[PDB]
Amino acid sequence: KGKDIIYGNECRNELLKGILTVSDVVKLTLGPRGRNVLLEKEYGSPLIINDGVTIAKQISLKDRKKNNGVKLMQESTQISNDKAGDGTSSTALMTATITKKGIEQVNRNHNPIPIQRGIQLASKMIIEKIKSLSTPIKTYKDILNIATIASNNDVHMGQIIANAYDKLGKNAAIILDDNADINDKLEFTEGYNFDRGIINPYLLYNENKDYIEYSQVSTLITDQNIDNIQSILPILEIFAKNKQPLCIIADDFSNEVLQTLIINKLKGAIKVVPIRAPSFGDRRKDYLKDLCIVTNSKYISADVGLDLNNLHNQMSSFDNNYLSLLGSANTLIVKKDRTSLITKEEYKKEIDERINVLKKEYEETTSKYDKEKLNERIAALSGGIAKILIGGNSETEQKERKFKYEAATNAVKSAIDIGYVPGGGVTYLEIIKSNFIQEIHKKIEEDLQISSNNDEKKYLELIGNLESEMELQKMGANIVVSSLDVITKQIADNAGVNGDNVVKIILNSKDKYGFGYDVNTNKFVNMVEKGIIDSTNVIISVIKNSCSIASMVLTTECMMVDHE
Amino acid sequence: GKDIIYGNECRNELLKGILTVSDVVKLTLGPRGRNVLLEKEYGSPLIINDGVTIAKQISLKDRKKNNGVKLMQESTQISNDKAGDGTSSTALMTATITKKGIEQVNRNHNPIPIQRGIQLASKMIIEKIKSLSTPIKTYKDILNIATIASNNDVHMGQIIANAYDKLGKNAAIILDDNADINDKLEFTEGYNFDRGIINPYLLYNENKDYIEYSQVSTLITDQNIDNIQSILPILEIFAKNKQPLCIIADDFSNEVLQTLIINKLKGAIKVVPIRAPSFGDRRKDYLKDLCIVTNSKYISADVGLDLNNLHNQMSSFDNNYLSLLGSANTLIVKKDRTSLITKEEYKKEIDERINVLKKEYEETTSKYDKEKLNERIAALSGGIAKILIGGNSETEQKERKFKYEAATNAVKSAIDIGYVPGGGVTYLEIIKSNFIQEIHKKIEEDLQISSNNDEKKYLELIGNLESEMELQKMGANIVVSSLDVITKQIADNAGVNGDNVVKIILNSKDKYGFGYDVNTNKFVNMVEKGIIDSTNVIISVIKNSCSIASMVLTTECMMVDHE
C-alpha cells in the first residue's frame, strides 16, 4: 500500500486530459446526424453506436491519474449511476471547453479564485437570462415536439409520450415497465396519485432501484401521527409473519418510530412503506377519506372514534380482525415526491359511486373555495396512471430504451413545469449575439464598487489588486460566454457542414429568437416553427453543471492515487 | 532483516514525511480551503475539503519517509479516529517548527538546547494564552464557538448550542447514529453521576473510546465485592443471556477485577464495573437514588441484603438472584460522568422520590444537609441530550459523528475559562506584543542562576555558555517565527495575499482581537463577528507541535524491516 500525491497545475492538467478525452469521444454524437463510434466487446461482438450516453459509460483510461477526470465527469453527469438525463452529451462538451479555457489561464501564474467567482456569477446570470427567454407549453404539438426532440428524434416513443399526456392530465404519473415484445405499447389504468413520496431515502438501501415497487400491498390509512410503536405492533407482527407487503399512510412519523424498527427491519423481514398524508391543513381528512374509499381501508382517526393509540380496547368494532381494518391495492409505486397506487378491480364501482356523489356536491355549493376543493378532490379520485411497456431486440436494448424513456419523460415534466426554448444550440448563441457578456461585466463592476469605495480603508488594496480582481472575474465570465457556440457548432459539424460558418450566420442574421439551422433537412429555418425545441430545465442544467465542474476543477489543488 | 539509519539522514526523511502531511493538509485550512481529489479503488473519486479525512489516507510508498506520516497520524490521534479540532493547524505548525529546527540541528549544532528552548517557549506561550482568555457568558458565544469548531456548519453548531442552552453547563450529550439525513436532537430523562471507566482496558475491542449498551440490567450494591463467588450465580445466569449487565459496587477488589477478562477473551459476559459516586456516607444515599431510578434491590448489610452469604437465615431473598437487579434503557460509560437513561416505567417512582427529597429540603436548617439534599434532587432530575447524527452515506454517518464529537469537545473545553479570537490572531498576538523578548529573559535568568553558582571552570570546558544560551533562544525564535502560518495559510487559501494580511494585522493600529474575515473579505473584529476558538484547542495545537518537534529533534535512529 502506498499513495502518490500530485499538486497544482499537474493535477489540473491530468484531470483536464481525462475531461477532454470524454468530450472528444462524446461530442462526435451531438445532434441527430452524429457520427458512429465502434466499441469492441471482449465477448466477441463489436457494437457501432451513435448514442453519447452508451459510449460515455464505457470510457476508461489505463492511466490511473488521467482516468480520474473520466470518472469525475461520468459521475457529475450521473452517467455511471444510470440516471443521466437529457443534455449530458452537450454538458460534456461545454464542460471540457470551459474547463480547458480556465485551466490554461490558471496554470499561467493567474489566480483561480476570481476566475471561479466570475464563472459562478456568469452561470447564475445566464440561467436567469435563459429563464427570461423561455416560453410556456400550451398546445399538444409542443409536448409532442419536446418529447420527440428529447428522444433523439424517435417518433415512436415521442408519440407514445404525447398520447400518454393527451389522454391524461398535465400532472400524469407515468410508470415505465419492462415488456417482452419488440414494440413499446401504451396502456392506461385507473389509480390514485397524490403529492407525497419517500420521506427517508434510507428505505432504498436494500433494493437500489431509486423507487419502491410492491405488488398487492395492504393499506393502513390513519389520520394521526404514529408515535408509540406499541400501537401498531400487532399489525406489524402479523405482516412480518405472513411476509405480505404493507403500506402505512399516516400524517406524521415520530423520530424514533421510523428508525428503531421500520427502516432497519424492512432490510430484515417486513415490507413497509411509510408515506405521509398530503395536506396543507385540515384538508388531510378529506384526502385520507378518498384514499380509504379507493382502497377500502377503514379510515382511522380519533374523530371517527377509531384511535390509533388504543386499538386493543375497541377490539369489538372492526370484527376483532386486525386485517379487516386494512385496505388493499393492486400496485404501489413510491417515487421521491409522488406516490401512486393502482386501484383494485373490485372497488371500481364503489369509487365511481363516490365520484358521482362528489359531483352532486359540486353543483350544490358556492363561495368558490368549496367548489375548488371538491374539484381537486374529484380530479384526484378519477385520475389515472399511464403504463408504458417498453421492449427491444435484446435484453440490453430494453434497458437502453428504458433509460431513454426515463430521460424523455423527465424532460417533458420539466417542460410542463417551466417553459421551453428553441433547440439547436440557438439559446446559447442568443446570449452571445445580444451582448449579455456586457451585463455580467456591469454586474461584477457593481459588486466590486459596493465593496471598494464603500470600505473607506486601503487595507483591501494591498492584499490584492482591484483592477486585477475585476479583470479576472470578467475573465471567468468571458470564458463561460465564449464556450457557448460549441454545442451548435459541433452539431452542425457532425452533419457535414461548416459549423463555425453556421454559427456566424445565426449570429449575424437578426431573425426572430429561434432562427437556426436544421441538420435533418440541412436548411436554415425557424426552430420554434419546425418543432426543434428543448426544455428550459435541460439547458439550464447543462450550463449549471458545466460551470460547477469547471469551478470545482479550478479549485482542486491536490490528487492522490494509491499506486507508486 | 532491518535497515538502520542514523542522524541527519533519519531526521531528513522523517521531516519529508511530516512535510508531505503538512503540504497536503494546509490546503484545506480555513473556511475557504481548496479541494483535494482522493481516488478510491472502488471506482469513484471524492473531492474533499476536510483536512482530517484527507490526512487519514496519506501514505507514502517510501517505507522510511512514510514513518513521518504515520508519526503525525498517531500524534494527532488521526489514525485512532480521535483527532479533535485544530489538528489541521497542528500539522502545519508542527511541520514548520520541525523543519526550522532540523535545518539548524543538521548544521553540526546541538539539538538539546534547541529542544529546551522549544519546550520553554511552548510552556510560556500556553501560560500567555491562558492569561489572554475571556470567560464565556452569553448564549451567542456558545453558538459561535460551536459553529466555528464545526467547520462553519450552522446546523450542527446550532444543535450543540441548543443542547447546552436547554441543559446545564455540563450537558451530558450522547452521540448516536441515525438512519435519516437530518441530524435530529432529542432530550430524555436520566441520571448522571461523576464516575467513569475505572479501567480503560475494557476498550481493547471497540475503538469507540466509550461504552454504550442498550437495555442493560443494573446490579447496584454498597459493599466491596471481595469474593467472586458472591456474584457467581448472576454471572453464570448472564453467561447464558446475551444481555448487557452493569455492576455498581463500592471498591471492586483486586482479584474480582477479572470480569473484564471474561468480557474481552470471549465476550461471553458483558459487565461494566463502575464505582460509587461519592466519597463517604453520601455514596450510600446516591446508591439508593440509583436503586430508585432503576428497579434495583439496593444491596448492603444495613438493609439486611448482604452481598456476602445471601443464603443466610432470617432473610427474604428467595435465592432467585434475578429480580434483585434493575434495568435501564441505555447506559453510557465514558472516562468520567456515567449516564443512564431513565426507563419509562419507573418515572413516577422517581418523581415521588424527588418530591420526598423536597419535603426534607424545607424541614432542615443545617446548611450542609440542605446543600447535599439540593445536589441530590438536582441529580435525580435533569436530562440527557441525544444527538441522532445522519448522512447521505454509511461513511458520512461516522464522519459527521467524529465532527460532532470534536465540536462538542471544543464547546466543553470552552465552557471552562476559554475564549479567544479566531482566524489565527491568537498566534499573532505573541508576535505583536514582543513576547519573544519575555522568553529570552526567562532563559537568561535560568542560565544566570546556574552560571554564577558553580564558581569553577567545570562547566566552561564542557560547553560554550554563550553558544548554549544562543541555541536556547534559537529554539524559542523557531517556535515564535512559525506562528503566522495559520492566518497566512487561511488568507492564501481564500485567494488573497496571506503575508500581507499578517503584516496588516501586526502593522495595524492599537487594537487587540482585530483580524481578517475570509468569508466576507474584510478586516473586522473576531470577537464581534463570532469568529472565536476555544483556548484549549489553541493550547493543544501549540503544545502538540512543540512536543513533536522536540521529539523528532531528539530522535537519532530509524529501523525499517526491508531493503
Ligand SMILES: Nc1ncnc2c1ncn2[C@@H]1O[C@H](COP(=O)(O)OP(=O)(O)OP(=O)(O)O)[C@@H](O)[C@H]1O
Ligand atoms: N433535428 C434537429 N436539428 C437541429 N438541432 C437538433 C435537432 N434535434 C436535436 N437538436 C439539438 O441537438 C441537441 C441534442 O443533441 P444529442 O441528442 O446528440 O445529445 P443531448 O440531447 O445533448 O444529450 P443526450 O445524448 O443524453 O440526449 C439539442 O440541444 C437540440 O437542440
Ligand SMILES: Nc1ncnc2c1ncn2[C@@H]1O[C@H](COP(=O)(O)OP(=O)(O)OP(=O)(O)O)[C@@H](O)[C@H]1O
Ligand atoms: N470565517 C473565518 N475567517 C477567518 N478565519 C477563520 C474563520 N473560521 C475559522 N477560522 C480559523 O480557522 C481555524 C480552523 O481551521 P480549519 O477548521 O480549516 O481546521 P482546524 O479547525 O484547525 O482543524 P480541523 O480541520 O480538524 O477542524 C481556526 O483556528 C479559526 O481561527
Ligand SMILES: [Mg+2]
Ligand atoms: Mg437527446
Ligand SMILES: [Mg+2]
Ligand atoms: Mg474546524
